[PDB]
Amino acid sequence: NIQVQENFNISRIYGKWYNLAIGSTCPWLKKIMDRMTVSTLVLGEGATEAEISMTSTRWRKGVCEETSGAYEKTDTDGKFLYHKSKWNITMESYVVHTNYDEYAIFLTKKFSRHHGPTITAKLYGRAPQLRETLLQDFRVVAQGVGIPEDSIFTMADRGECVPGEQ
């Protein structure tokens, strides 16, 4: 019953966010989640007006790693499609709760030819910290979509990196 947030204003979701917590039923993600530190995400206008540019930056091993993708708007505001045609993988993301100015929770369903669908939940803040109560909100939202409590991780802040830096 994944629920897009009502009266969703996509123009207000743009800009910079920090990933502060994550949970997932994806076996691989389950194994690496504890290595993840607070990462930055920037949402902007895509190549076309129907795309959203996604840019994520995090420490991985020694370096500042940037991942970039183009998400497609769909027939539903708050729902975005991310197709990896080379992989035959489709991810579909949902903004289930946000107040635009402080926090957002995104749920992402991943469809593969080779395993059952997985679900991943991420908590974002406009700043690298938020009240404990939002952490709790996130926990219940993730559990309510089938993520076990043992598969939910609050990330350490370490802090931000910029690609190109020295």
Name every residue whose Cβ is closer than 8 Å to that of residue 108 and which is 6 or more positions away in sequence: 91, 92, 93, 94, 119, 120, 121, 122
Q: Which amino acid is at 106?
A: F
Name 93's bridge partners: 80, 108
The DSSP output letter for 109 is E
**26 assigned ligand-binding residue:** yes
Q: How many CA atoms lie within 13 A of 134 on its CB side?
A: 22
157's CB contacts (< 8 A; 6+ apart) are 18, 20, 37, 38, 128, 129
SS3 11: helix
Its CATH class, for the domain covering 1-166, is: mainly beta
- Annotated binding-site residue? 161: no
In angstroms, the CA 124 to CA 131 distance is 12
64 in a labelled binding site? no
Experimental method reported for this structure: X-ray
How many Å apart are CA 52 and CA 39, to the nearest integer?
Answer: 19
In terms of Cα–Cα distance, which of 160, 78, 149 is closest to 127?
160
